[PDB]
């Protein structure tokens, strides 16, 4: 049967193994908040466990997730000689209990487990308190034993909880249970559940915690703490459509870099699953926005550019970068806000005889302003008489081709590149529909 | 023919090519500290103050060398009545290189090639002082000729050192020597070393340095510099127990890989010299601790897991690695801290007919989460080791040392006192 009672001033344990004296210290950790109801019987993030019987009838603890042989289960057995700690996936029964001494009623048989530990048992008018907490693969047991007068409920007083053991187990835990060792009988215990709080602890001159105050109980305690002393709606537009990203990709015909195609996309639902659906992209980098969050933003207008680049020159496409195509074929602004995708095409845009079909400009009188395109075929003048005729001597002709064969290694094979540029903080945006 | 003498205040050179007037300046650079020891008659360190006082000009040329032979690049500076020649050729020098006056075979037996040539007006034309300083692929020479009255030692005076030449040679240097020209003769020169210091230099209105004060000579000079004007204990627990690393090793009986021996080592002094004198280990790797720095830390617990694996499967013992031995025999956690050691045991566990006392797992339903082994028992196949087997198949003994940190006060640490 169950019952209820108040936690009072209980459940305070030394946060660390650091010595201090006569200094008030502020800690932020898991504790059992003051004046709370703890269940009385006749896991979550921690356990405060308490009992008061003398006949040693209470013993052992089972921790686990399924209470079955399919997952590891902490088992703490205690007897007059030693304490045994095991991590074995036992086949527990409905009501496990020590026979007193066979364990077949506790569980069926032993199986896979690693940590076996033996030590001096914890147990030795008396009340026993324990705090169990699991965090980052570590299982910490704090204990205390107090001499309690003839009192029915938890006594009004303060008792710090020293560490007892710290084990590196690392098991996913959801529930626990306590065993009994018996002929019928009756016994009781109090269970309470931890929460993250902030405490102000007072160490005396001997190093032992004597008092502490909760920082979020009542405004008086909040004042004590701060003084350090003891005195959703979404309204996206209705239109549903599909941005033709499928048309931008797999077009089977990409333009040469010195004349890069430009496609404007607006008035549609922007779904970016198809991008990752396409291919294992060699490079996929977004500058002004995280690549994962394209699916919940809204943009004014988007632009798609597409061309083909020699692989080793893919890094040449980046804001504030230099290189022949950086300054002569395709210039990106320093304040770029978008994404760039580049993937190998060596199997489709190469030929043994030489698939040229792709040109790039390397001679140009002046540097390219960002997002410019230049399409002239005029013969570069080197600083002499006008060679309107032909390159001839000092004058030169631009636009060499590319040569792609399957025999070339990486760094010369063709890579298809698509650049998406975004528009922010403008007239009412239109390309966003992945959410209702 | 050595002797020691006091430097007084000499050896101050213009730090740069900047012109200043009537302004005191503070500089941090290499200088010869005031009132130091200088030798009267060779490592190079960081720079050199060189001085001589002969009028016959018998001294001529410094031979900068790293190997002092024809093997490595050497700077040779030669001076004659008409020119000065700087070469980077690695000549074949002798024990006592000296000129003949004019054959140079005495100085060096033979010549070779090099990649530099410089010719200019000769350095020399009383005391002559030079400062040699090499840094960041640049060799700088500062020089000064000071006429001194009839006197014995370096005069109580001040004279700045003006730049002479910079050369971008970019080779290291450590030694230099002295040349003499010949009948009996007498030579004598002073040598002193440089050090990084801070000086306060006073320019006059024509740009010539006239006075300087060191910033560490004596507290009054410290005051002048700052005012910018001219007016470990080691303790450890007393336990002396030796850690039982020798018992784990050379046990003449190593368990099968599928049931590896686990030993706990604690409350002792751990010494890893047995690790190196044990044998020439084939594999010795460490992940969380530098292998050479295992001697200087405090540890709480040590775990030793010993087993036997094939020669080619030694690489399978590694955190975050896949393989039959990794997934069905023994797996290390991705955050495992410790070391892995492996040595050949072909001459120990290779029977002529084959040894079948070692067995491994091939079949199991589920993967093995780190730090657990299978005992239940064809899912298990015995090994085969013979002396005729080549590399990659001979048995190898592998021991992993599992380590843990950030726990109760450590006990296994007494490698130092």
């Amino acid at each position: 049967t169950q019952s209820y009672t108040n936690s009072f001033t209980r459940g305070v344990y030394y946060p660390d193994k650091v010595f201090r004296s006569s200094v008030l210290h502020s800690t932020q950790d898991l504790f059992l908040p003051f004046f709370s109801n703890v269940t009385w019987f006749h896991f979550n993030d921690g356990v405060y466990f308490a009992s008061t019987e003398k006949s040693n009838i209470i013993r052992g603890w089972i921790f686990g997730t399924t209470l079955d042989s399919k997952t590891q289960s902490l088992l703490i057995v205690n007897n007059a000689t030693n304490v045994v700690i095991k991590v074995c996936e036992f086949q527990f029964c409905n009501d496990p209990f020590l026979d007193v001494e066979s364990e077949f009623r506790v569980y069926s048989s032993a199986n896979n487990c690693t940590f076996e530990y033996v030590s001096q048992p914890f147990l030795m008018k008396n009340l026993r308190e324990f705090v169990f907490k699991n965090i980052d693969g570590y299982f910490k047991i704090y204990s205390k034993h107090t001499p309690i007068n003839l009192e029915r409920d938890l006594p009004q007083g303060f008792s710090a909880l020293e560490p007892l053991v710290d084990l590196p187990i690392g098991i996913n835990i959801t529930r626990f249970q306590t065993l009994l060792a018996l002929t019928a009988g009756a016994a009781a215990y109090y269970v309470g559940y931890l929460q993250p709080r902030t405490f102000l602890l007072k160490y005396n001159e001997n190093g032992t915690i004597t008092d502490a105050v909760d920082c979020a109980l009542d405004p008086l305690s909040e004042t004590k703490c701060t003084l350090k002393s003891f005195t959703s709606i979404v309204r996206f537009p209705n239109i549903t459509n599909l941005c033709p990203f499928h048309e931008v990709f797999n077009a089977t015909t990409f333009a040469s870099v010195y004349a890069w195609n430009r496609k404007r996309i607006s008035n549609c639902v922007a779904d970016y699953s198809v991008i990752y659906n396409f291919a294992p992209f060699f490079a996929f980098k977004c500058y002004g926005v995280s690549p994962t969050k394209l699916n919940d933003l809204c943009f004014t207008n988007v632009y798609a550019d597409s061309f083909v680049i020699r692989g080793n020159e893919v890094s040449q496409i980046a804001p504030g970068q230099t290189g022949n195509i950086a300054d002569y074929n395709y210039k990106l602004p320093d304040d770029f806000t978008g994404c760039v995708i580049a993937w190998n095409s060596n199997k489709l845009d190469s030929k043994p005889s030489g698939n040229y079909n792709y040109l790039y400009r390397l001679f140009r009188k002046s540097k390219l302003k960002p997002f410019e395109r230049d399409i002239s075929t005029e013969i570069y003048q080197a600083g002499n008489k006008p060679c309107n005729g032909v390159a001839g001597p000092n004058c030169y002709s631009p636009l060499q081709s590319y040569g792609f064969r399957p025999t070339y290694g990486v760094g010369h094979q063709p890579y298809r590149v698509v650049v998406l540029s975004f528009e922010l903080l403008h007239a009412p945006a239109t390309v966003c529909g992945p959410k209702k | 023919t050595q002797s020691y003498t006091n430097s007084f205040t000499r050896g101050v050179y213009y730090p740069d090519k900047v012109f200043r007037s009537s302004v005191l300046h503070s500089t941090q650079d290499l200088f010869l500290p005031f009132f130091s020891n200088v030798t009267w008659f060779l490592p190079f360190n960081d720079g050199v103050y060189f001085a001589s006082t002969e009028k016959s000009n018998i001294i001529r040329g410094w031979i900068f060398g790293t190997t002092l032979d024809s093997k490595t690049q050497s700077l040779l500076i030669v001076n004659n009545a008409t020119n000065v020649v700087i070469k980077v050729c690695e000549f074949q020098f002798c024990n006592d290189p000296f000129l003949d006056v004019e054959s140079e075979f005495r100085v060096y037996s033979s010549a070779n090639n090099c990649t530099f040539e410089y010719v200019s007006q000769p350095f020399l034309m009383n005391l002559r002082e030079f400062v040699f300083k090499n840094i960041d692929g640049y060799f700088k020479i500062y020089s000064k000729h000071t006429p001194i009255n009839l006197e014995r030692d370096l005069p109580q005076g001040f004279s700045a050192l003006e730049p002479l030449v910079d050369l971008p040679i970019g080779i290291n240097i450590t030694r230099f020597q002295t040349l003499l020209a010949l009948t009996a003769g007498a030579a004598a020169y002073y040598v002193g070393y440089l050090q990084p210091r801070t000086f306060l230099l006073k320019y006059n209105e024509n740009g010539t340095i006239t006075d300087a004060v060191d910033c560490a000579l004596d507290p009054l000079s410290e005051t002048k510099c700052t005012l910018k004007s001219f007016t470990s204990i080691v303790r450890f627990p007393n336990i002396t127990n030796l850690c039982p690393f020798h018992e784990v090793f050379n046990a003449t009986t190593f368990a099968s890989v599928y049931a590896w021996n686990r030993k706990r080592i604690s409350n002792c002094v751990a010494d890893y010299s047995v690790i190196y004198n044990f044998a020439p280990f084939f594999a010795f790797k460490c992940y969380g601790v530098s292998p050479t720095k295992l001697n200087d830390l405090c540890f709480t617990n040590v775990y030793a897991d010993s087993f036997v694996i094939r020669g080619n499967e030694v690489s399978q013992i590694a955190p975050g690695q896949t393989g039959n031995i990794a997934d069905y025999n023994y797996k290390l956690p991705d955050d495992f801290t410790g070391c892995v050691i492996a040595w050949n045991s072909n001459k120990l566990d290779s029977k002529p007919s084959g040894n079948y006392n070692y067995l491994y797992r091939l079949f199991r339903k589920s993967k093995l989460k780190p730090f657990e082994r299978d005992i239940s028992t064809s899912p298990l196949q015995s090994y085969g080791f013979r002396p005729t087997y080549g590399v990659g198949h001979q048995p190898y003994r592998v021991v992993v040392l599992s380590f843990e940190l950030l726990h109760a006060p450590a006990t296994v640490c007494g490698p130092k006192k």
Partner: nanobody
């Protein structure tokens, strides 16, 4: 240091019977599993059969009926009853004590059958 005493081998005619016995003294820690391996003359070592500490038996040969395994919990010993002998089982026999950490091996028993 553990000792695995082996007994009960020798010469038996075809169709005979014998009782091999392995007793493990020394450490032989509590979660032990006791097995029997066979070694043919100049051949690979295969496994006769294994008995666990929870009385579970795993025979590594289609040989059920031929070997029968009996356990002695009071002395923690393992006995193999050999019946209906055929010449193809003429091989030396060792017992294998996995213990929990360090597995061991026997000394050897000569089992021979011919006619």
């Amino acid at each position: 240091q553990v000792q695995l005493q082996e007994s009960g081998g020798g010469l038996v005619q075809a169709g005979g019977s014998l009782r091999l016995s392995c007793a493990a003294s020394g450490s032989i820690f509590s979660p032990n599993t006791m097995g029997w391996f066979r070694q043919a003359l100049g051949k690979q070592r295969e496994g006769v059969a294994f008995i666990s500490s929870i009385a579970s038996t795993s025979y590594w040969l289609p040989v059920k009926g031929r070997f029968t395994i009996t356990r002695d919990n009071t002395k923690n010993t393992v006995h193999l009853q050999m019946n209906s002998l055929i010449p193809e089982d003429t091989a030396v026999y060792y017992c294998y004590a996995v213990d929990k950490s360090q597995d061991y091996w026997g000394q050897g028993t000569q089992v021979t059958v011919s006619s």
